Amino acid sequence: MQYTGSQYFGEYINGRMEGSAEYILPTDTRYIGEMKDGMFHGEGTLFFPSGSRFDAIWKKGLVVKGKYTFNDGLQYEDKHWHYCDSYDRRFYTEICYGLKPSGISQLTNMDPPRRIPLGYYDCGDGFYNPTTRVIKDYRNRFLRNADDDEHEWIVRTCRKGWLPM
């Protein structure tokens, strides 16, 4: 446990763990899991530091699974993903509700309505300006910086905090 930070709540045999259990990993990831021989030997779900869920089934202490779901509960495909795309460009809440229940300007990814404050952009996590090559976090502190390739991607693809025309 201590030497990496791992945590477990369950049963012990010979001093090594054999359990149906909830669990924490020094990612500060949470997990629910079954164990054998002091190893995971279970079908179990991994709850992110960001809450979202990965799933892990264990064969002889190795993983063989596919499922993901976001922390909002959006169900996801790692392949072909049919979402907000050619069949319909609607977000998770906009597909579930349709028109968001009262049509608040959150017919868009984040609102109530405002300009992006600093300048910069929206790319969901962070504000970034192509005139500064800096990303920022929604507390207006900072995020990873980016040269030409990512700068050019942001410049074309997403929404600047231009002045609201």
Partner: protein, 285 residues
């Protein structure tokens, strides 16, 4: 014993190479972001651990032999790092270096170093592959041929110029006479590159005026390109040979011409200055 280090040096050292990536030995490097976990999740430097803070004390990351980890580095976003710089002064056999522009310009010039992957396992570190190296700050790069071909490396620096002295073909700018410079000869000492240096320097300079992004190579990052950089620096700054050589020595520590090329550079110096200002009798050439 706390010192300022330019981000260009970070890009030199952290993708320094010598057969191996130097990242595949820990005594080479340590780098320890004191700041939030959440920033580190969003990314970090290309071996940079996440610091643990506890009741505003830092929990020593003895991930490595801190006693002698020869290069020893810290960054905040900008320049709580400073006090970590202070504490470190007790430790390493070398002085301890702060990364001027801890994040903002260094990755703003080179995004790719950001990544959500934390450790790179010893196989994965050893398997690493270098980005091109930077000679003239922000403006001209140095590369080995398989870097110069590497699609991602070429694209990510938004590059279009080649500058090379070699026989061996490369995939891009074929016949683009103004956005390709290529010369052909062996690294043989009778290759009288002296004249070609003037053309090379003027071509690079023109891309400076154009702000074109330029890579230099001599197949292996070896020798011809090194002499051409000596000529370029001496003519660009009216510097002595010894100054340009000292800069080149760090630029990539493998860089080295040959003794006939040394003679050519000595004549380049005597042509620019009018006389020899550097004495070749030392072994440091």
């Amino acid at each position: 014993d706390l010192l300022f280090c330019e981000p260009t040096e970070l890009y030199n050292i952290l993708n320094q190479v010598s057969k191996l990536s130097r990242l595949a030995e820990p005594n080479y490097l340590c780098l320890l972001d004191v700041r939030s976990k959440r920033q580190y999740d969003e990314s970090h430097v290309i071996t940079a651990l996440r610091v643990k803070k506890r009741d505003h004390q830092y929990l020593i990351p003895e991930s490595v032999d801190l006693e002698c980890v020869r290069y020893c580095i810290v960054y905040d976003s900008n320049t709580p790092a400073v006090e970590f710089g202070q504490i470190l002064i007790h430790f390493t056999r070398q002085p301890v270096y702060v990364l001027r522009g801890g994040y903002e310009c260094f990755s703003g010039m080179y995004h790719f170093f950001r990544t959500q992957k934390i450790i790179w396992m010893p196989q994965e570190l050893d398997a690493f592959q270098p980005y091109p190296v930077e000679i003239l700050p922000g403006r001209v790069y140095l590369g080995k041929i398989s870097q110069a071909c590497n699609a991602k490396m070429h694209k990510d620096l938004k590059i279009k110029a080649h500058v090379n002295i070699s026989m061996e073909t490369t995939p891009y700018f074929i016949g683009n006479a103004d956005k390709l410079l290529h010369i052909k000869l062996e690294d043989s000492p009778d290759t009288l590159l002296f004249d070609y240096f003037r053309h090379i320097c003027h071509f690079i300079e023109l891309h400076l005026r154009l702000h074109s992004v330029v890579l230099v190579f001599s197949t292996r990052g070896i020798s011809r390109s090194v002499a051409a950089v000596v000529a370029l620096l001496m003519h660009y700054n009216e510097e002595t040979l010894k100054r340009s050589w000292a800069q080149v020595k760090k630029c990539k520590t493998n860089m080295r011409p040959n003794r006939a090329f040394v003679a050519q550079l000595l004549e380049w110096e005597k042509v620019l200055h009018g006389e020899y200002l550097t004495d070749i009798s030392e072994p440091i050439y």
